[PDB]
Amino acid sequence: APDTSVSNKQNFSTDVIYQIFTDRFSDGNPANNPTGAAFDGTCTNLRLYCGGDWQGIINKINDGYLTGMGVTAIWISQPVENIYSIINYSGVNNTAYHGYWARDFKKTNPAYGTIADFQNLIAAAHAKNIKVIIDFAPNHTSPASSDQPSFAENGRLYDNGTLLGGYTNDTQNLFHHNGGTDFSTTENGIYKNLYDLADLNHNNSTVDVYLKDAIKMWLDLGIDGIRMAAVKHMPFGWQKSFMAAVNNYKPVFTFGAWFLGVNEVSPENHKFANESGMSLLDFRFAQKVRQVFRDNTDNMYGLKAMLEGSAADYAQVDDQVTFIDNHDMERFHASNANRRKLEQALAFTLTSRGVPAIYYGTEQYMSGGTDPDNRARIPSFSTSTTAYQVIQKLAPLRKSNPAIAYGSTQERWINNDVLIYERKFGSNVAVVAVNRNLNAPASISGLVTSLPQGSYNDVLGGLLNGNTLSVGSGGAASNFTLAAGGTAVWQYTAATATPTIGHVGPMMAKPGVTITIDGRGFGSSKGTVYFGTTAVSGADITSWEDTQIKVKIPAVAGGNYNIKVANAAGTASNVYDNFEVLSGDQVSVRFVVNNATTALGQNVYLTGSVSELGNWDPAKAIGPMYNQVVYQYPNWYYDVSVPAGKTIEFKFLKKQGSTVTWEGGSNHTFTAPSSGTATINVNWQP
Numbered sequence: 001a002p003d004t005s006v007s008n009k010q011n012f013s014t015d016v017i018y019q020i021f022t023d024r025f026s027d028g029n030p031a032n033n034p035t036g037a038a039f040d041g042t043c044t045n046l047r048l049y050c051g052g053d054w055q056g057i058i059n060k061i062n063d064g065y066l067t068g069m070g071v072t073a074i075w076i077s078q079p080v081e082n083i084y085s086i087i088n089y090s091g092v093n094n095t096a097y098h099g100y101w102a103r104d105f106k107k108t109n110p111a112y113g114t115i116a117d118f119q120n121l122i123a124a125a126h127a128k129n130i131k132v133i134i135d136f137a138p139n140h141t142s143p144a145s146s147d148q149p150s151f152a153e154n155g156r157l158y159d160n161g162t163l164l165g166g167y168t169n170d171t172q173n174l175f176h177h178n179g180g181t182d183f184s185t186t187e188n189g190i191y192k193n194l195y196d197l198a199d200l201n202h203n204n205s206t207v208d209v210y211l212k213d214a215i216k217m218w219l220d221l222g223i224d225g226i227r228m229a230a231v232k233h234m235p236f237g238w239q240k241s242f243m244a245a246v247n248n249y250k251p252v253f254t255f256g257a258w259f260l261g262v263n264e265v266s267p268e269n270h271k272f273a274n275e276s277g278m279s280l281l282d283f284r285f286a287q288k289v290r291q292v293f294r295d296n297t298d299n300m301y302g303l304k305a306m307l308e309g310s311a312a313d314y315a316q317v318d319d320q321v322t323f324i325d326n327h328d329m330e331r332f333h334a335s336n337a338n339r340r341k342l343e344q345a346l347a348f349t350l351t352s353r354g355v356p357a358i359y360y361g362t363e364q365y366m367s368g369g370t371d372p373d374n375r376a377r378i379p380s381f382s383t384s385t386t387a388y389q390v391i392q393k394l395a396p397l398r399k400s401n402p403a404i405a406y407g408s409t410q411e412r413w414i415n416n417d418v419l420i421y422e423r424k425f426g427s428n429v430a431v432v433a434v435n436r437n438l439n440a441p442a443s444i445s446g447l448v449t450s451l452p453q454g455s456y457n458d459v460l461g462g463l464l465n466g467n468t469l470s471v472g473s474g475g476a477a478s479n480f481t482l483a484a485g486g487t488a489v490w491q492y493t494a495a496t497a498t499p500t501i502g503h504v505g506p507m508m509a510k511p512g513v514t515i516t517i518d519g520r521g522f523g524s525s526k527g528t529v530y531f532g533t534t535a536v537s538g539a540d541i542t543s544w545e546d547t548q549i550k551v552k553i554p555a556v557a558g559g560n561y562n563i564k565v566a567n568a569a570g571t572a573s574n575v576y577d578n579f580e581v582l583s584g585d586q587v588s589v590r591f592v593v594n595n596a597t598t599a600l601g602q603n604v605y606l607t608g609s610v611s612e613l614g615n616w617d618p619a620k621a622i623g624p625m626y627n628q629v630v631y632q633y634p635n636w637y638y639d640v641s642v643p644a645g646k647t648i649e650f651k652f653l654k655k656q657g658s659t660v661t662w663e664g665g666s667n668h669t670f671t672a673p674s675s676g677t678a679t680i681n682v683n684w685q686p
């Protein structure tokens, strides 16, 4: 199977995701529609079920709506069973139409469909080479009150019909009872209730195993991706252990939703995306895009900055899910706005690095403010829109031109409003020119690219006022005029002689697990695969062709390895660093250190004898540890993914910048549980 195959559950870079808000997409089966006050067939009240279901999606898949657009993957709402109550928030009735109020992760939302329906959906999708990504909010269940078991459904958690427990009288401790968060701090937003949502307690073995077990089911149902909701409100350590469970079972492309406000650039975010075991939704990208094309709060320069920075801050930038809007923010298009702004933001996104995600209805020019105003039912399924044609013309590129999927990003021409960038990958190139200035044209001279000499027509067919590019010798493009609001796309594709790695997934797993290595120039005859200095060939290399290679992770020590391959001839390829070989099966372990006083700026960290602990390396130490919610200073705590069953030696550190002060005495010792969670409580040694 080629990298572009719908079977590629590890790489979406060649795909164009279509974010589908089920309830608001299409009602293929009204027999499952909810009744009474929880439903509004007219979709006037955006806080109630409108009827959108899985069958609706199947129909959309079969009727060529999505396919005709060039969509190769969908991102659907959480499939799990949600609460049935109609939460009345100050005289305002609310329903779980959004599917974020789960009540049983092992069951499905009868409103969307049945297991069978879901199965038919996946079947339909794959039949149309369409990948299926499902939302997953294992951070909570539903709204609930501790003193009012009457409100909502008390956040009651079910395990395939069997009541596990509720928020009230939670003597089991399945949830956190630290009130709500004010998003003041990361730890704050983690161990506190996301709004009024019953915050699950992943430190609880039951909850931990149940959740992991639940994902297994959906994984067995054939899903091709996982969009993790509120990845910022869940302990980072546990999520890794969760990614480990997935990857060590049935690895599938996963990305979390980590909100990033305007002009917000988080290192924690970069780190999470770099070591969580999952990617992230490129909010930084989206916000900048909006600032540049929608709000005009920044120019091409800010865009370029975002591009370069992100390409350096993200270990695997091509794994970041890009977008221009979503269900959590005002639709990119404003009723009064100039359509070209959206079309441009679209063209840009569809040709940039990462995995482009398109919010349903965007191609219909839907406008709307904050939720639920941004979740209106798709006005129509018209293929006549310009946005539709844009996507339609650009999307396929992600499959025909590896430069777009895995290529690099280099600015070739730039100014306040004009931006001309190039994507390169092997013998493939893509030059994109965007003139956001809707009132002024731009004289493009001195443009240099990697495009071989030749005449290049606009792949957009002048759709966005594009033009033909004339490339002479040296990649020098003859002077040309870039129409106002003009957007062109020139490309070059050719066979790649030398082995080039464009993607690798998953990026974190234990030996014996099969990773997927995509790119071009691998050759038909099997070659060699390197996990650092360790060479792997023959049998452990399940499959090998030109664009895709399947191989089992060698039994090497835990840690980061630099992947690389060599054709049957010995010709070595580029390097795809940052691969993580786990020490084995993982389990979320909570470490607690007491009496660890410190001074402002000084934060406690954790080090240990395993790669999951940094192998005694302070730079790779775990932390900074928390000390506010669950435990209070001088008491520090933190949930960490450690190799299960293993006997690990660990020590605590006191960090100040990169200056480290080691713990005294001897190493602490403990043996990781074989499964479930555990709490290692030790005192700081002077």
Ligand SMILES: OC[C@H]1O[C@H](O[C@H]2[C@H](O)[C@@H](O)[C@@H](O[C@H]3[C@H](O)[C@@H](O)[C@@H](O[C@H]4[C@H](O)[C@@H](O)[C@@H](O[C@H]5[C@H](O)[C@@H](O)[C@@H](O[C@H]6[C@H](O)[C@@H](O)[C@H](O)O[C@@H]6CO)O[C@@H]5CO)O[C@@H]4CO)O[C@@H]3CO)O[C@@H]2CO)[C@H](O)[C@@H](O)[C@@H]1O
Pocket (backbone or CB within 6 Å): 089, 094, 098, 100, 137, 143, 144, 145, 146, 179, 180, 181, 193, 194, 195, 196, 197, 228, 229, 230, 257, 327, 328, 371
């Ligand atoms: O002791 C009292 C009480 O305290 C705590 O609870 C209070 C809470 O701390 C406090 O903030 C407040 O909460 C209210 C909030 O301030 C209001 O904004 C409102 O919330 C509405 C949201 O603004 C609105 O966007 C929407 O939110 C839901 C989304 O529609 C839905 O899609 C989903 O959001 C998901 C994102 O879309 C998705 O991308 C992402 O992946 O995951 C998100 C989360 O799943 O979920 C959103 C939340 O349901 O509707 C909201 C309407 O409810 O109402 C809040 C409730 O009043 O008051 C709280 C009560 O005082 C404690 O936590 C609590 O235990 C305690 O009783």
Ligand SMILES: OC[C@H]1O[C@H](O[C@H]2[C@H](O)[C@@H](O)[C@@H](O[C@H]3[C@H](O)[C@@H](O)[C@@H](O[C@H]4[C@H](O)[C@@H](O)[C@@H](O)O[C@@H]4CO)O[C@@H]3CO)O[C@@H]2CO)[C@H](O)[C@@H](O)[C@@H]1O
Pocket (backbone or CB within 6 Å): 185, 597, 598, 599, 600, 601, 602, 603, 627, 628, 633
């Ligand atoms: O925004 C949240 C903050 O998060 C991070 O802060 C860390 C600090 O870097 C740590 O030093 C630690 O803070 C301890 C502090 O070490 C300790 O001395 C004590 O501070 C007292 C202080 O002695 C007293 O003079 C006065 O300042 O009151 C303080 C409160 O008692 O307690 C602190 C813990 O509350 O932990 C925090 C995280 O909680 C981050 O580095 C900061 O930028 C950020 O503000």
Ligand SMILES: OC[C@H]1O[C@H](O[C@H]2[C@H](O)[C@@H](O)[C@@H](O[C@H]3[C@H](O)[C@@H](O)[C@@H](O)O[C@@H]3CO)O[C@@H]2CO)[C@H](O)[C@@H](O)[C@@H]1O
Pocket (backbone or CB within 6 Å): 411, 412, 413, 414, 415, 445, 446, 447, 448
């Ligand atoms: O001496 C060679 C020269 O080449 C490289 O410059 C390129 C710029 O980096 C690139 O931005 C582009 O420049 C255009 C500007 O963006 C635009 O504002 C306007 O001024 O036209 C310019 C083209 O004439 O192209 C040039 C290459 O042509 C390299 O970065 C330089 O360091 C180097 O001096």
Ligand SMILES: OC[C@H]1O[C@H](O[C@H]2[C@H](O)[C@@H](O)[C@@H](O[C@H]3[C@H](O)[C@@H](O)[C@@H](O)O[C@@H]3CO)O[C@@H]2CO)[C@H](O)[C@@H](O)[C@@H]1O
Pocket (backbone or CB within 6 Å): 616, 651, 662, 663, 664, 667
């Ligand atoms: O590097 C591997 C090694 O790391 C860990 O050892 C650290 C000690 O725990 C820590 O106390 C500190 O040791 C210094 C002593 O305190 C000091 O008295 C004198 O002996 O110098 C030491 C400096 O090396 O730092 C080391 C790491 O630098 C871990 O505990 C070991 O098990 C592990 O082998």
Ligand SMILES: [Ca+2]
Pocket (backbone or CB within 6 Å): 027, 028, 029, 030, 031, 032, 033, 051, 052, 053, 111
């Ligand atoms: Ca229905």
Ligand SMILES: [Ca+2]
Pocket (backbone or CB within 6 Å): 139, 189, 190, 191, 192, 199, 200, 233, 234, 235
């Ligand atoms: Ca949480």
Ligand SMILES: [Ca+2]
Pocket (backbone or CB within 6 Å): 314, 315, 316, 576, 577, 578
């Ligand atoms: Ca990298």
